[PDB]
Amino acid sequence: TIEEQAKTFLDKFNHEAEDLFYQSSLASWNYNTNITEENVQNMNNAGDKWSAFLKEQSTLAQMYPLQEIQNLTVKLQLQALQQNGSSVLSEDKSKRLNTILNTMSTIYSTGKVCCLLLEPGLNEIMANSLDYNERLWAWESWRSEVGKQLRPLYEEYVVLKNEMARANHYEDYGDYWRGDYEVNGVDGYDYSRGQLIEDVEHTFEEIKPLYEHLHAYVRAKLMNAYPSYISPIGCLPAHLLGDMWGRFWTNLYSLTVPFGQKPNIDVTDAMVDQAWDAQRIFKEAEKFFVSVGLPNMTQGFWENSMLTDPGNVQKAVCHPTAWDLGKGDFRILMCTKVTMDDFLTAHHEMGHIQYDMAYAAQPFLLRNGANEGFHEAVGEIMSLSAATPKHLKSIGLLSPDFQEDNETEINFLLKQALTIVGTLPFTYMLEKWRWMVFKGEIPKDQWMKKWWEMKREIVGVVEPVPHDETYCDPASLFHVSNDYSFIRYYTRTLYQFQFQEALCQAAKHEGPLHKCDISNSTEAGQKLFNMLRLGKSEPWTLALENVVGAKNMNVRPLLNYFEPLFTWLKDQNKNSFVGWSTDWSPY
């Protein structure tokens, strides 16, 4: 029977792939820890072997019929293995597409404004200089260089990707991206492709009032910052958001301080005074995860992984990552110093690790999160729990008494909203525009006009000077020019709060949800572990059912999280005007 043929084939593959993947991951880790010569050729050889093996296995698996298999897990593994990808196109077209991607990445990497590069001077210049003219000049120069240089390349990329995706029985490349949130074969849990185009605009219409009030409050604060520069009814400029693309508004925290009398909670000096050796941070995070009820760390974790920078003589990457090399090897690569940010990043990375240890029993092809969003929410909720005053008081670094005055809560919630709720409209607008461009409903002649009118409508941001058709603003962003999906952040931002509310309710915590704690609640740990262990063997709808009891994403917990801030904003904005007008322009 073909069923047993597929089972035997997967049985052989699992072992072969496990071995080759361990070799490749070990070589990559040895390069990242030791970036010297003779470590690059090894990485390239290992990656080439792994890619050739994957392609040959795909060709071999292409022979077996797919619809015949019916075990719903062997079928999943075979379907995951059968992905032609770029092999459908001719060799010359594939080479040209690879060249286009490489040259776009190179152009993005190498950009000069005059000398002045992107990192780190330009971002730091925009962060704190707070001068209208020079910030406008830098923004306009960067746009008029990058967008000018990548227009025809982007058009050719669009058409090539669209035809390639149409070659694989999909509708468009946007549909190929949307196909990640696909489940079939399980009645009562099916999720169609087109349902993701909904549940995003529909859910965004629920969160409109909070974003509107936050936008009005930030507008008023900017009016305070720049008196005779912004109309009371006009929209915000693009170069006053405090960031290059306006993806995050956190840089505007200094201007939009709710109450400057009460400072924020900072315990860095507490860790400095007690001389935390940068190893006890990980011990404390491990103790937290044990108190929740999750398994202890592997013995080899404490010896194989690196936490302190190797030194001045040897240079290594300090980008924090959590490596799962397979065969029972889990490591963490992160340069740690004494700071609250390092504490929260350590908690997030150990959350990643504890997720990885949960589904190690699954076969090789099913060792991933249920969808592309479940892996970051689990990491973020640990930081959310460990940032509360309760857990900070549990350890001795924070003073046992404190003040817990409401101003502190308002300030913390405002600062958190400037980052969490100020990025949903931008991500939604960008993804919607890219979907409509790939679908072809938006012709070539109306790219920039559509982009800027959508910016005026949804995000409420107006460009400083008009741009002709030759400009290309979306291509300036990192993810756009590097061929990455950008819808993951929007869904993660909601799954995070869904999980937090479910865990807090299961822990019978009373009071506001923004000051909830999960430590010393073994029932919450068990409920979370019952979903972590699942892996990718179940539809993400049923996996979501095991935590919150719902089969779809919802924005209500997110609105309840900012409830004190919502009331304070209502009271503060009852006088000032609410809304934006697209007619007004800076020029």
Added chain:
Amino acid sequence: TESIVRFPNITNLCPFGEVFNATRFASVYAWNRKRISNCVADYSVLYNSASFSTFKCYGVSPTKLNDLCFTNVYADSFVIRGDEVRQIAPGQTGNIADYNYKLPDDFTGCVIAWNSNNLDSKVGGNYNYLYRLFRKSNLKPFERDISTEIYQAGSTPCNGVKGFNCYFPLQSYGFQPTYGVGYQPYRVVVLSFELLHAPATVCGPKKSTNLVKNKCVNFNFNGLTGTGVLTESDAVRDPQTLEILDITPC
């Protein structure tokens, strides 16, 4: 009245040191069996060596075996994964117990497994140890298969070449010093005590005393206990004199 103990006179130390401290252990798929007879067996240091990750004795208590006799002992030894040691026990299934080594239900021995991550594992992978993955039928208890014919899964005969739907059965273990506990090498030794109607050979270590006649006394001959009057001639054969003695209930 009195108690007499009689065991055969053997002064040959049992060669457990050669099997346990062997330089190289055989692969799991093709293991090596060592036969042991005519020795005095000291199961004390074996149990309390304080360096064994698992010492499970089936059939008989692990401590009483210091004063019992069997016909002979079979010792098997090999190397497996840390997580597969569980399958070396009666009534277990998997990919080891099906195709490599299946113990029978009436097992009357011991299983001793200890970690060997220092010797077998090396940087880059130690591909010397192999295990059998595919086989047409499950193994019968205590059976060895060494053939390496290409296992056929599809209908078309591949004629002994590695064609489509045909697979090389033996797959190589990989070992590295940085693996996890569930993937590091473990050396396993299985002791089977087999006894027949033939006189016992492996015994000890226990002292012996002189034989008595009449004078109803408790006794244990060759590990079997009794009470009564021994008369020269239900009955036992002397393990050092070869004379039949009759037992009468006093």
